[PDB]
Design an enzyme around this catalytic site. Structure first.
Site, PDB file in Angstrom:
ATOM      1  N   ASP A 155     -29.606 -22.635 -63.632  1.00 46.71           N
ATOM      2  CA  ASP A 155     -28.175 -22.342 -63.503  1.00 46.71           C
ATOM      3  C   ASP A 155     -28.027 -20.856 -63.161  1.00 46.71           C
ATOM      4  N   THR A 181     -20.906 -24.775 -61.716  1.00 48.22           N
ATOM      5  CA  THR A 181     -22.052 -25.496 -62.227  1.00 48.22           C
ATOM      6  C   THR A 181     -21.949 -27.021 -62.067  1.00 48.22           C
ATOM      7  N   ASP A 213     -27.860 -17.945 -65.700  1.00 48.83           N
ATOM      8  CA  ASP A 213     -26.388 -17.920 -65.686  1.00 48.83           C
ATOM      9  C   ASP A 213     -25.763 -17.361 -66.987  1.00 48.83           C
ATOM     10  N   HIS A 257     -26.050 -22.347 -57.931  1.00 43.76           N
ATOM     11  CA  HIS A 257     -25.152 -21.318 -57.336  1.00 43.76           C
ATOM     12  C   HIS A 257     -25.715 -19.970 -57.791  1.00 43.76           C
ATOM     13  N   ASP A 273      -6.565 -35.239 -38.327  1.00 45.98           N
ATOM     14  CA  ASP A 273      -6.966 -35.569 -39.692  1.00 45.98           C
ATOM     15  C   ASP A 273      -5.767 -35.426 -40.646  1.00 45.98           C
ATOM     16  N   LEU A 293     -12.401 -37.243 -41.832  1.00 42.33           N
ATOM     17  CA  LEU A 293     -12.778 -38.295 -40.853  1.00 42.33           C
ATOM     18  C   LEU A 293     -11.724 -38.543 -39.786  1.00 42.33           C
ATOM     19  N   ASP A 313      -8.933 -39.743 -37.587  1.00 40.31           N
ATOM     20  CA  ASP A 313      -7.805 -40.650 -37.835  1.00 40.31           C
ATOM     21  C   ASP A 313      -7.796 -41.754 -36.774  1.00 40.31           C
TER      22      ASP A 313
HETATM   23  C1  LIG Z   1     -19.108 -38.312 -47.671  1.00 38.78           C
HETATM   24  O1  LIG Z   1     -19.867 -39.496 -47.934  1.00 38.78           O
HETATM   25  C2  LIG Z   1     -19.117 -40.482 -48.646  1.00 38.78           C
HETATM   26  C3  LIG Z   1     -19.997 -41.680 -49.038  1.00 38.78           C
HETATM   27  O2  LIG Z   1     -20.406 -42.403 -47.873  1.00 38.78           O
HETATM   28  C4  LIG Z   1     -17.914 -40.894 -47.791  1.00 38.78           C
HETATM   29  O3  LIG Z   1     -17.010 -41.547 -48.693  1.00 38.78           O
HETATM   30  C5  LIG Z   1     -16.795 -42.934 -48.415  1.00 38.78           C
HETATM   31  O4  LIG Z   1     -15.764 -43.045 -47.447  1.00 38.78           O
HETATM   32  C6  LIG Z   1     -15.438 -44.413 -47.112  1.00 38.78           C
HETATM   33  C7  LIG Z   1     -14.298 -44.442 -46.069  1.00 38.78           C
HETATM   34  O5  LIG Z   1     -13.216 -43.619 -46.519  1.00 38.78           O
HETATM   35  C8  LIG Z   1     -14.962 -45.131 -48.393  1.00 38.78           C
HETATM   36  O6  LIG Z   1     -14.805 -46.506 -48.087  1.00 38.78           O
HETATM   37  C9  LIG Z   1     -13.673 -47.099 -48.768  1.00 38.78           C
HETATM   38  O7  LIG Z   1     -14.158 -47.734 -49.942  1.00 38.78           O
HETATM   39  C10 LIG Z   1     -13.223 -48.483 -50.707  1.00 38.78           C
HETATM   40  C11 LIG Z   1     -13.975 -48.997 -51.931  1.00 38.78           C
HETATM   41  O8  LIG Z   1     -14.201 -47.835 -52.716  1.00 38.78           O
HETATM   42  C12 LIG Z   1     -14.732 -48.125 -54.030  1.00 38.78           C
HETATM   43  O9  LIG Z   1     -16.077 -48.618 -54.007  1.00 38.78           O
HETATM   44  C13 LIG Z   1     -17.015 -47.714 -53.414  1.00 38.78           C
HETATM   45  C14 LIG Z   1     -18.381 -48.392 -53.285  1.00 38.78           C
HETATM   46  O10 LIG Z   1     -18.910 -48.542 -54.590  1.00 38.78           O
HETATM   47  C15 LIG Z   1     -20.153 -49.277 -54.660  1.00 38.78           C
HETATM   48  O11 LIG Z   1     -21.274 -48.618 -54.056  1.00 38.78           O
HETATM   49  C16 LIG Z   1     -21.582 -47.304 -54.555  1.00 38.78           C
HETATM   50  C17 LIG Z   1     -22.731 -46.662 -53.750  1.00 38.78           C
HETATM   51  O12 LIG Z   1     -22.333 -45.405 -53.225  1.00 38.78           O
HETATM   52  C18 LIG Z   1     -21.826 -47.370 -56.077  1.00 38.78           C
HETATM   53  O13 LIG Z   1     -22.001 -46.085 -56.622  1.00 38.78           O
HETATM   54  C19 LIG Z   1     -20.660 -48.104 -56.770  1.00 38.78           C
HETATM   55  O14 LIG Z   1     -20.820 -48.177 -58.172  1.00 38.78           O
HETATM   56  C20 LIG Z   1     -20.428 -49.496 -56.147  1.00 38.78           C
HETATM   57  O15 LIG Z   1     -21.539 -50.368 -56.314  1.00 38.78           O
HETATM   58  C21 LIG Z   1     -17.029 -46.439 -54.277  1.00 38.78           C
HETATM   59  O16 LIG Z   1     -18.027 -45.512 -53.896  1.00 38.78           O
HETATM   60  C22 LIG Z   1     -15.629 -45.800 -54.313  1.00 38.78           C
HETATM   61  O17 LIG Z   1     -15.679 -44.620 -55.096  1.00 38.78           O
HETATM   62  C23 LIG Z   1     -14.511 -43.774 -54.935  1.00 38.78           C
HETATM   63  O18 LIG Z   1     -13.443 -44.081 -55.842  1.00 38.78           O
HETATM   64  C24 LIG Z   1     -13.834 -43.985 -57.231  1.00 38.78           C
HETATM   65  C25 LIG Z   1     -12.710 -44.451 -58.162  1.00 38.78           C
HETATM   66  O19 LIG Z   1     -11.512 -43.794 -57.775  1.00 38.78           O
HETATM   67  C26 LIG Z   1     -14.288 -42.556 -57.583  1.00 38.78           C
HETATM   68  O20 LIG Z   1     -14.839 -42.561 -58.887  1.00 38.78           O
HETATM   69  C27 LIG Z   1     -15.338 -42.041 -56.594  1.00 38.78           C
HETATM   70  O21 LIG Z   1     -15.567 -40.638 -56.798  1.00 38.78           O
HETATM   71  C28 LIG Z   1     -14.906 -42.303 -55.147  1.00 38.78           C
HETATM   72  O22 LIG Z   1     -13.728 -41.547 -54.955  1.00 38.78           O
HETATM   73  C29 LIG Z   1     -13.708 -40.964 -53.645  1.00 38.78           C
HETATM   74  O23 LIG Z   1     -13.448 -41.906 -52.592  1.00 38.78           O
HETATM   75  C30 LIG Z   1     -12.164 -42.538 -52.632  1.00 38.78           C
HETATM   76  C31 LIG Z   1     -12.061 -43.542 -51.461  1.00 38.78           C
HETATM   77  O24 LIG Z   1     -12.873 -44.702 -51.688  1.00 38.78           O
HETATM   78  C32 LIG Z   1     -11.083 -41.443 -52.572  1.00 38.78           C
HETATM   79  O25 LIG Z   1      -9.775 -41.985 -52.697  1.00 38.78           O
HETATM   80  C33 LIG Z   1     -11.290 -40.415 -53.687  1.00 38.78           C
HETATM   81  O26 LIG Z   1     -10.374 -39.353 -53.563  1.00 38.78           O
HETATM   82  C34 LIG Z   1     -12.690 -39.825 -53.647  1.00 38.78           C
HETATM   83  O27 LIG Z   1     -12.816 -39.120 -52.440  1.00 38.78           O
HETATM   84  C35 LIG Z   1     -14.631 -46.842 -54.862  1.00 38.78           C
HETATM   85  O28 LIG Z   1     -14.976 -47.154 -56.204  1.00 38.78           O
HETATM   86  C36 LIG Z   1     -12.657 -49.609 -49.827  1.00 38.78           C
HETATM   87  O29 LIG Z   1     -11.658 -50.306 -50.535  1.00 38.78           O
HETATM   88  C37 LIG Z   1     -12.077 -49.049 -48.519  1.00 38.78           C
HETATM   89  O30 LIG Z   1     -11.651 -50.120 -47.674  1.00 38.78           O
HETATM   90  C38 LIG Z   1     -10.218 -50.106 -47.389  1.00 38.78           C
HETATM   91  O31 LIG Z   1      -9.808 -49.153 -46.404  1.00 38.78           O
HETATM   92  C39 LIG Z   1     -10.373 -49.329 -45.097  1.00 38.78           C
HETATM   93  C40 LIG Z   1      -9.703 -48.351 -44.134  1.00 38.78           C
HETATM   94  O32 LIG Z   1      -9.966 -47.027 -44.539  1.00 38.78           O
HETATM   95  C41 LIG Z   1     -10.270 -50.772 -44.551  1.00 38.78           C
HETATM   96  O33 LIG Z   1     -11.173 -50.953 -43.472  1.00 38.78           O
HETATM   97  C42 LIG Z   1     -10.498 -51.843 -45.640  1.00 38.78           C
HETATM   98  O34 LIG Z   1     -10.121 -53.125 -45.189  1.00 38.78           O
HETATM   99  C43 LIG Z   1      -9.746 -51.498 -46.929  1.00 38.78           C
HETATM  100  O35 LIG Z   1      -8.342 -51.522 -46.677  1.00 38.78           O
HETATM  101  C44 LIG Z   1      -7.593 -52.186 -47.732  1.00 38.78           C
HETATM  102  O36 LIG Z   1      -7.396 -51.391 -48.902  1.00 38.78           O
HETATM  103  C45 LIG Z   1      -6.637 -50.198 -48.686  1.00 38.78           C
HETATM  104  C46 LIG Z   1      -6.626 -49.347 -49.956  1.00 38.78           C
HETATM  105  O37 LIG Z   1      -7.953 -49.009 -50.297  1.00 38.78           O
HETATM  106  C47 LIG Z   1      -5.222 -50.547 -48.213  1.00 38.78           C
HETATM  107  O38 LIG Z   1      -4.519 -49.369 -47.882  1.00 38.78           O
HETATM  108  C48 LIG Z   1      -5.237 -51.517 -47.013  1.00 38.78           C
HETATM  109  O39 LIG Z   1      -3.909 -51.952 -46.728  1.00 38.78           O
HETATM  110  C49 LIG Z   1      -6.224 -52.686 -47.235  1.00 38.78           C
HETATM  111  O40 LIG Z   1      -5.723 -53.605 -48.192  1.00 38.78           O
HETATM  112  C50 LIG Z   1     -13.102 -48.131 -47.810  1.00 38.78           C
HETATM  113  O41 LIG Z   1     -14.231 -48.845 -47.366  1.00 38.78           O
HETATM  114  C51 LIG Z   1     -15.925 -44.953 -49.588  1.00 38.78           C
HETATM  115  O42 LIG Z   1     -15.295 -45.405 -50.786  1.00 38.78           O
HETATM  116  C52 LIG Z   1     -16.320 -43.500 -49.770  1.00 38.78           C
HETATM  117  N1  LIG Z   1     -17.350 -43.352 -50.843  1.00 38.78           N
HETATM  118  C53 LIG Z   1     -17.301 -42.355 -51.753  1.00 38.78           C
HETATM  119  C54 LIG Z   1     -18.373 -42.292 -52.814  1.00 38.78           C
HETATM  120  O43 LIG Z   1     -16.461 -41.454 -51.793  1.00 38.78           O
HETATM  121  C55 LIG Z   1     -17.171 -39.682 -47.230  1.00 38.78           C
HETATM  122  O44 LIG Z   1     -16.212 -40.162 -46.279  1.00 38.78           O
HETATM  123  C56 LIG Z   1     -18.127 -38.686 -46.593  1.00 38.78           C
HETATM  124  N2  LIG Z   1     -17.359 -37.508 -46.170  1.00 38.78           N
HETATM  125  C57 LIG Z   1     -17.368 -37.008 -44.934  1.00 38.78           C
HETATM  126  C58 LIG Z   1     -16.455 -35.843 -44.668  1.00 38.78           C
HETATM  127  O45 LIG Z   1     -18.102 -37.506 -44.056  1.00 38.78           O
HETATM  128 CA   LIG Z   2      -8.660 -38.746 -41.380  1.00 41.27          CA
END
Ligand SMILES: *[C@@H]1O[C@H](CO)[C@@H](O[C@@H]2O[C@H](CO)[C@@H](O[C@@H]3O[C@H](CO[C@H]4O[C@H](CO[C@H]5O[C@H](CO)[C@@H](O)[C@H](O)[C@@H]5O)[C@@H](O)[C@H](O[C@H]5O[C@H](CO)[C@@H](O)[C@H](O)[C@@H]5O[C@H]5O[C@H](CO)[C@@H](O)[C@H](O)[C@@H]5O)[C@@H]4O)[C@@H](O)[C@H](O[C@H]4O[C@H](CO)[C@@H](O)[C@H](O)[C@@H]4O[C@H]4O[C@H](CO)[C@@H](O)[C@H](O)[C@@H]4O)[C@@H]3O)[C@H](O)[C@H]2NC(C)=O)[C@H](O)[C@H]1NC(C)=O
Ligand SMILES: [Ca+2]
Ligand SMILES: CC(=O)N1CCN(c2ccc3ncn(CC(=O)N(C)Cc4ccc(C#N)c(Cl)c4)c(=O)c3c2)CC1
Ligand SMILES: [Cl-]
Ligand SMILES: [K+]
Ligand code: NA
Length: 806
Positions: A118, A156, A258, A306, A684, A690, A692
């Protein structure tokens, strides 16, 4: 509550109630069995063998053992072989290349040990070298970077969990050392039990990735009261378990340097001892591995979270000096600021008024306020409900606080901290360390600086795991490894371009545009058609066309001086590519051409922008992606005013863009021996980093379907060997890129009332970006056709030009 740790000390699987616990986290939970200190935290006789202990009769009360049965039991003191068997300390041995893993029978793969420190600032490797011999041996014999870039904020927990997940804090959810979640209505702090709740911790950390794929790994957390010597002995005891029980991945954590750095500053004289003490701990680990015949088997990563900067109480900006109504806000304070309304669901709290009151109010002001969507995109610090809408980026060496009473505590406030961290992750004092040592890492190898987000993929490679989806670019760190298990390949192009010819007569257009282009041969007639067909394309498209990685309709448009990929959906280029040699001449936009815009006879009226919309929209103007200032001839300049080269620009932003195009591009061409430029829009609106889709766009040019970009990018490439011109480069490339926010004012730049020569380049430097950042924001893939290896191109695409000194 009830039970015993007999036979259970530092057990790997955690037990639930009724049973009490004996694992390495039970202290944090106050849930250890009553005999945990007695059985599991033995201290008797300290941590080192002495000559009189050699061959002793085993006394089970001792912290560690010097009895003859101790190697078999796996519980010798780490210096046992040195004191009792004439062996040498690992640090005293010559560096010898580890060409293959040299592991005991039963080891299915080289274990990975992550040693995290750290607050270990990058320059400690040089400045503390005389007092860190074990670390300096790991560094010189193994693979090292001169520094490793943390994530923002440079705190951290966000950085340690990024190490574990490969994710930006906005994705993994640990967005600070302190955070408030408005959905939970709860606060996370370093101290206390709330952080134990899994609801805060997203993504998939390495221990879970390993376990899901049958590789044994516990969490990387440690209870603070367990001393370092006991953490090392515990790891060495685990490494002695039967094959079927033994983990393959291990984590050691040190709270130093740290802890001392906060008290004494990064280079306080008090800092020498904690560096010596961490080095001694490294020596205990290496000696212990050498005893177990594992020192040419295990891969060790020595990594920091860091660095540390000089920060004192007197360098605190107070919001009460700027805001009359400071009791209406809550501030997460310190080396960053995050502001939200004091009372939730308050109708008459105005973020715009707060921002205004904090903007360029004092000439030496040591913070800058931002709406989080306006922060530099390189910080990737917006897409999480735990990140407040108002963010203050604090200058290095400074703090922000809400009121003086927060800092100067009663009686009369003495300071007693001299160091802190948390600032912008490009800041030199925040940079940290990376060393990899072992059979899978390279021997005596220096690698360029890289970002900590990349390590999760490497750690997965080191363990034969498939990484969960993350923000690393897998392959970009293949150059760290002697043996790679991952072969990166380019993503497949999804949309193929159209190549339109001349298809529309001038009178088919009703775009409301005008141009003085009728004025003023058989020689330059064929040459024009050749250029429109792509004759100069190898000059202006140096690395192939970008691949479009999503479904869309677009046209490749060729010109004498530039090539573009023109979207029929967004009505503007996705990318415009052009090369400017060192010898290129800058010219003006001729008087008669000031307001010239010309229909493009290759592109239908229906898929064109129109000048009327720009006339009607009193806030929105336009600029051009290929700059008319850099036309090769007065005749080629007319191509720059095509409607297909036009993009929507606020007048405030046009000041920035026009200075870049007229002054800076030629400057970079002069300094770099030509440059190739690829420029374009970014949309965006939901600030997720990502591209739009069209249905996410929230602003159009008034009364049209012309979408307004949130940002404009450029990628500026040249030859790394600048004795070769950009367009005739035989070797590795050099890149710098930016993502400029497309803002209707220049409030971000406090000096913007001055000539652009005093402020534009400073703004561009702040918004420096990696090519990879632009790829996420555009769905394009660059550098498709080069003579360089793909792994090398992936490293290029992760490069960030930071503009810091040394
Ligand atoms: C950096 O890399 C990361 C990782 O690749 C990128 O982040 C990914 O970005 C994806 C696209 O935005 C996003 O896909 C979403 O996923 C939705 C499901 O999300 C939940 O499940 C995820 C998967 O979990 C499983 O696998 C992982 C392995 O990694 C395991 O660890 C798990 O235990 C499971 O087995 C999960 O990771 C995700 O976690 C987020 O939310 C948690 C609870 O809030 C948080 O604890 C956690 O920290 C994560 O939070 C982040 O991400 C969320 C967005 O998911 C965000 O809001 C937070 O602020 C924070 O940033 C969840 O638990 C899925 O439903 C989505 O699909 C909908 O939308 C798309 C269109 O965008 C449609 O195609 C699809 O049909 C569907 O639409 C429907 O639902 C909509 C509402 O959701 C609705 O409006 C619509 O009308 C429809 O009904 C989509 O696939 C990934 O979730 C995300 N992963 C992570 C970890 O963040 C990131 O983009 C990269 N960054 C850059 C700049 O490149
Ligand atoms: Ca965007
Ligand atoms: C996600 C999960 O499995 N959880 C939530 C956290 N829980 C938990 C329970 C008990 C603890 N005792 C002590 N410390 C302090 C500590 O471990 N430091 C300061 C070092 C460290 C090491 C790795 C990472 C990483 N990555 C981080 Cl960030 C910090 C805890 O942080 C701690 C956390 C365990 C269950
Ligand atoms: Cl924080
Ligand atoms: K206008
Ligand atoms: Na300004």
């Amino acid at each position: 509550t009830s039970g015993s740790c007999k036979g259970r000390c530092f057990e790997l699987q955690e037990v639930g109630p009724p049973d009490c616990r004996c694992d390495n986290l039970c202290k944090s939970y106050s849930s250890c069995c009553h005999d945990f200190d007695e059985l599991c935290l033995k201290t008797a006789r300290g941590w080192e063998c002495t000559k009189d202990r050699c061959g002793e009769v085993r006394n089970e009360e001792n912290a560690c053992h010097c009895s003859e049965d101790c190697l078999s039991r796996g519980d010798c003191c780490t210096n046992y072989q040195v004191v009792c068997k004439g062996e040498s300390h690992w640090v005293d041995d010559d560096c010898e290349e580890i060409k293959v893993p040299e592991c005991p029978a039963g080891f299915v793969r080289p274990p990975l040990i992550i040693f995290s420190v750290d607050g270990f600032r990058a320059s400690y490797m040089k400045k503390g070298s005389k007092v860190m011999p074990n670390i300096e041996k790991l560094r010189s014999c193994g693979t090292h970077a001169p520094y490793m870039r943390p994530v923002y904020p440079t705190k951290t927990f966000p950085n340690l969990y990024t190490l574990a997940t490969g994710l930006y804090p906005e994705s993994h959810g640990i967005v600070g050392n302190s955070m408030y979640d408005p959905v939970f209505d709860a606060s996370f702090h370093l101290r206390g039990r709330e952080k134990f709740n899994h609801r805060w911790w997203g993504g998939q950390p390495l221990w879970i990735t390993a376990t899901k794929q049958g590789v044994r790994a516990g969490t990387f957390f440690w209870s603070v009261s367990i001393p370092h010597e006991r953490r090392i002995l515990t790891i060495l005891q685990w490494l002695s378990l039967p094959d079927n029980e033994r983990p393959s991945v291990y984590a050691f954590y040190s709270e130093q340097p740290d802890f001392s750095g906060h008290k004494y500053g990064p280079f306080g004289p008090e800092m020498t001892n904690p560096l010596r003490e961490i080095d001694k701990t490294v020596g205990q680990l290496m000696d212990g591995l050498k005893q177990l015949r594992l020192h040419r088997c295990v891969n060790v990563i020595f990594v920091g979270d860091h660095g540390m900067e000089d920060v004192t109480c007197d360098r605190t900006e107070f919001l009460s000096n700027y805001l009359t109504n400071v009791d209406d806000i809550t501030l997460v304070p310190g080396t960053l600021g995050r502001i939200r309304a004091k009372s939730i669901n308050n109708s008459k709290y105005d973020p715009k008024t707060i921002i205004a009151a904090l903007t360029c109010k004092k000439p030496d002001q040591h913070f800058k306020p931002y709406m989080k969507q306006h922060l530099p995109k390189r910080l990737h610090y917006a897409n999480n409900r735990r990140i407040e809408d108002i963010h203050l980026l604090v200058d290095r060496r400074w703090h922000v606080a809400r009121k003086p009473l927060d800092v100067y505590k009663k009686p009369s406030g003495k300071c007693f901290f001299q160091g802190d961290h948390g600032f912008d992750n490009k800041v030199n004092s925040m940079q940290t360390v990376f060393v990899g040592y072992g059979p899978t890492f390279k021997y005596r190898t220096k690698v360029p600086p890289f970002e900590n987000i990349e390590l999760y993929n490497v750690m997965c490679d080191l363990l034969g795991l498939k990484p969960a989806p993350n923000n690393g670019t897998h392959g970009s760190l293949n150059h760290l490894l002697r043996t790679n298990t991952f072969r990166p390949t380019m993503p497949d192009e999804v949309s193929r371009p159209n190549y339109p010819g001349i298809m529309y007569l001038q009178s088919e257009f009703d775009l409301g545009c005008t141009c003085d282009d009728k004025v003023e041969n058989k020689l330059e007639e064929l040459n024009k058609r050749l250029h429109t067909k792509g004759s100069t394309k190898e000059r202006h498209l140096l690395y192939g066309r970008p691949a479009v990685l999503y479904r869309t309709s677009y046209d490749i448009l060729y010109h004498t001086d530039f090539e573009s990929g023109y979207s029929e959906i967004f009505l503007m280029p996705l990318w415009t590519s052009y090369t400017i040699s060192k010898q290129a001449e800058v010219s003006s936009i001729p008087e008669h051409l000031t307001n010239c815009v010309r229909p493009d006879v290759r592109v239908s009226p229906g898929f064109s922008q129109n000048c009327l919309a720009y006339k009607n929209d009193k806030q929105m103007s336009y600029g051009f992606l290929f700059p008319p200032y850099l036309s090769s001839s007065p005749e080629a300049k007319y191509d720059a005013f095509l409607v297909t080269n036009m993009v929507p620009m606020y007048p405030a932003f046009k000041r920035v863009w026009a200075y870049f195009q007229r002054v800076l591009v030629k400057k970079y061409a002069s300094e770099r021996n030509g440059v190739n430029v690829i420029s374009g829009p970014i949309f965006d609106y939901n600030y997720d980093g990502l591209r739009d889709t069209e249905d996410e766009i929230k602003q159009y040019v008034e009364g049209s379907s012309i979408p307004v970009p949130t940002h404009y990018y450029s990628i500026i490439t040249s030859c790394l060997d600048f004795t070769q011109p950009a367009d005739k480069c035989d070797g590795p490339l050099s890149v710098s890129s930016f993502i400029l926010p497309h803002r209707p004012d220049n409030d971000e730049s406090c000096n913007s009332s001055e000539d652009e020569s005093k402020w534009v380049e400073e703004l561009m430097k702040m918004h420096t970006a990696r090519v990879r950042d632009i790829e996420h924001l555009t769905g394009l893939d660059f550098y498709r056709k080069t003579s360089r290896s793909y792994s090398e191109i992936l490293t290029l695409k992760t490069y960030l030009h930071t503009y810091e000194s040394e």
